[PDB]
């Protein structure tokens, strides 16, 4: 019912459409990337510093991790918005990795919306500290993604990319991703 065809439309980056967004993959360095949000995948106290987080926290700077702690002390927090700091971004979205992750996408994408956002760029979402399966990660964020699009709820968002640190796991999207391909 939703969705379209895998294709490379650049070196190292795999596409394909879902109703009207285009879902892309692709391994790099997250840092590197520009989109209206940046999602950081961390602990439950938001400030965990190693391998995604660690590159996250590092290149956004002091303020970014000065706002994650003073939000934490304010509530209980299922994920936390920061500015960007040093990042290509207008906000980061801090998820809990060891979170559900379908849930996770549902409220990263729901909050982009609301800011009238059209760009998302996330990382493969628990698979580091949290050590979640890369297939389940794989299947919980499409599945996010068609939820969203199947309840008529896309409107401003048009693309949605997964900057995934390890070839190895790259691999495993790109699979989910034929498995659902029209
Ligand atoms: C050995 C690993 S796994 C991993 N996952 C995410 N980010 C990383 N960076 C860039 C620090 C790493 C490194 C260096
Ligand atoms: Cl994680
Ligand atoms: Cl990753």
Not at 32 to 36: N, R, S, V, Y
Not at 131 to 155: N, R
Not at 172 to 175: G, L, S
């Given at each position: 019912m939703?969705?379209?065809?895998?294709?490379?439309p650049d070196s190292g980056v795999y596409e394909m459409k879902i109703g009207s967004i285009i879902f892309q993959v692709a391994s790099g360095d997250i840092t590197?990337?520009?989109?209206?949000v940046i999602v950081n995948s961390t602990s439950n106290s938001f400030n965990l510093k190693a391998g995604v987080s660690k590159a996250i926290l590092?290149?956004?700077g002091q303020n970014v991790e000065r706002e994650c702690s003073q939000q934490a002390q304010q509530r209980k927090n299922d994920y936390i918005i920061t500015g960007g700091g040093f990042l290509r971004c207008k906000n980061i979205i801090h998820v809990i990795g060891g979170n559900d992750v379908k849930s996770s996408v549902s409220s990263v994408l729901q909050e982009c919306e609301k800011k009238n956002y059209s760009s998302i760029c996330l990382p493969a979402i628990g698979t580091g500290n949290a050590?979640?399966?890369?297939?389940?990660?794989?299947?919980?964020?499409?599945?996010?993604?068609?939820?969203?699009?199947?309840?008529?709820?896309?409107?401003s968002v048009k693309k949605v990319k997964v900057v995934i640190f390890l070839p190895q796991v790259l691999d495993?999207?790109?699979?989910n991703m034929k498995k659902r391909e029209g």
């Open positions: 939703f969705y379209g065809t895998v294709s490379s590197k990337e520009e989109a209206d590092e290149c956004a050590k979640q399966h890369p297939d389940k990660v794989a299947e919980a964020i499409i599945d996010a993604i068609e939820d969203f699009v199947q309840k008529g709820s896309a409107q495993v999207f790109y699979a």
